[PDB]
């Protein structure tokens, strides 16, 4: 018993895991993953950001790679993390050139090293992101409800640089995102009811 830290900048900024995926790799004789890096998946960060309406921040992405065992020993793989911004169409003919195009930003990192850390700037047509968008997607007149085409950051694409390695090890990739330079507007009420789906606001009760 018995204002510095109360600031919004320190409140919304924390390191959390927004994506968890492990691809099975044993014998292929492909391996890759892409995701829209959105805050509606991880449940604790979602409700954390449901408090505010519009948000302005720079996403800081850090990729942590761990290799498990399914004594051989752990070889050192080379991984490539590429960020695909919104507007780049993806006609995937893998084994050939899209990844290696100089337009998209890519980073190379080994297994044993400081985790790869990149800072994504603020990419928007409008002034800030829209967490709550009342309306429909584009002008289709019946277009999708609850999704604003104006705000899409892009897709995070990560693959292994080296060719097939004859091991039965499974590669585990963890992606942490800590926002910086956070600006808040229009605080809203918290949502006590559970999340039925990430696509809209429907509640069960």
């Amino acid at each position: 018993t018995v204002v510095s830290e109360t600031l919004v900048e320190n409140f919304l900024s924390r390191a959390a895991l927004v994506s968890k995926r492990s691809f099975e790799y044993k014998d292929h004789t492909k391996n890759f993953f892409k995701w829209t890096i959105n805050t509606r998946s991880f449940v604790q960060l979602r409700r954390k950001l449901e408090l505010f309406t519009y948000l302005r921040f720079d996403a800081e992405i850090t990729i942590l790679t761990t290799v498990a065992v399914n004594y051989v020993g752990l070889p050192d793989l080379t991984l490539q993390a590429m960020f695909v911004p919104t507007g780049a169409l993806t006609p995937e003919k893998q084994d050939s050139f899209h990844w290696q195009s100089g337009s998209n930003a890519s980073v190379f990192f080994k297994i044993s090293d400081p985790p790869a850390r990149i800072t994504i700037p603020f990419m928007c047509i409008n002034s800030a992101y829209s967490v709550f968008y009342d309306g429909f997607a584009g002008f289709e007149k019946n277009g999708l409800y609850g999704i604003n085409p104006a705000d899409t950051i892009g897709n995070l694409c990560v693959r292994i640089v080296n060719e097939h390695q004859p091991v039965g090890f499974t590669v585990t990739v963890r992606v942490y995102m800590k926002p910086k330079h956070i600006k808040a507007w229009a605080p809203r009420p918290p949502r006590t009811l559970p999340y039925m789906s990430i696509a809209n606001a429907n509640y069960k009760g």
Binding site: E5, T6, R14, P85, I118
Partner: protein, 221 residues
């Protein structure tokens, strides 16, 4: 060049660290900042806004009537209306509020609170009430006079339509306070008006309310 040596703990990944990293897309200018009404630079401004307390929490109480407390004309003199625990972590009337929901992200909380009561009944409703507060370990009042030994005010339906109550700096972290309300006199309403009236409680935070030690919200949903 400049000889350097690695310090213990170099290369580790910390969750709470703050450092500059290489930008992903250089030579890119973000959209300029338009002025957006309601810029919130501190979480205390959200807490200082008044919120609704639910005083009607009981068995078989669901929906809109959980916000109001029914008071009829058939009640007797000196009957306990309700009690409001001040515990944020446990479930009182304060479980879901503006001060409660934000404090669940923290542990230590210290500051002075405020309570506002509003009478939603008709204009001709007469009678008086009593509004008392219980100090920590304050021998919760059996009927009336025990509540009178502390800070109290006599509130009338006809004169004042609102209540201003300043509570002196509670404290809690990881039975202390209470609010006692009784019937001073009978409820006097005319023949045309309804017999049952209600009330709505409010709570806000003062300028001395402080927070720290961020944590995870206990409620998953």
């Amino acid at each position: 060049g400049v000889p350097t040596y690695l310090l213990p703990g170099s290369g580790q990944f910390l969750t709470t660290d703050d450092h500059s990293s290489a930008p992903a897309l250089p030579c890119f200018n973000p959209t300029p900042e338009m002025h957006i009404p309601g810029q919130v630079r501190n979480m205390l401004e959200v807490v200082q806004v008044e919120s609704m307390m639910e005083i009607n929490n009981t068995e078989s109480a669901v929906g809109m009537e959980r916000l109001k407390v029914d008071i009829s004309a058939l009640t007797d003199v000196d009957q306990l209306l309700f009690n409001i625990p001040l515990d944020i972590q446990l479930d009182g009337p304060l479980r879901n509020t503006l001060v409660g929901n934000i404090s669940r992200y923290y542990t230590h909380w210290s500051g002075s609170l405020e309570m506002t009561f509003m009478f939603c009944g008709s204009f001709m409703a007469a009678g008086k009430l009593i509004l008392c507060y219980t100090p920590p370990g304050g021998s919760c009042p059996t009927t009336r006079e025990t509540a009178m030994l502390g800070t109290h005010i006599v509130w009338d339906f006809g004169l004042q339509s609102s209540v201003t109550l300043i509570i002196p700096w509670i404290s809690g972290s990881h039975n202390v306070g209470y609010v006692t309300c009784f019937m001073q006199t009978n409820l006097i309403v005319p023949s045309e008006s309804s017999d049952t009236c209600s009330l709505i409680g409010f709570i806000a935070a003062k300028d001395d309310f402080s927070l720290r030690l961020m944590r995870d919200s206990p409620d998953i949903g």
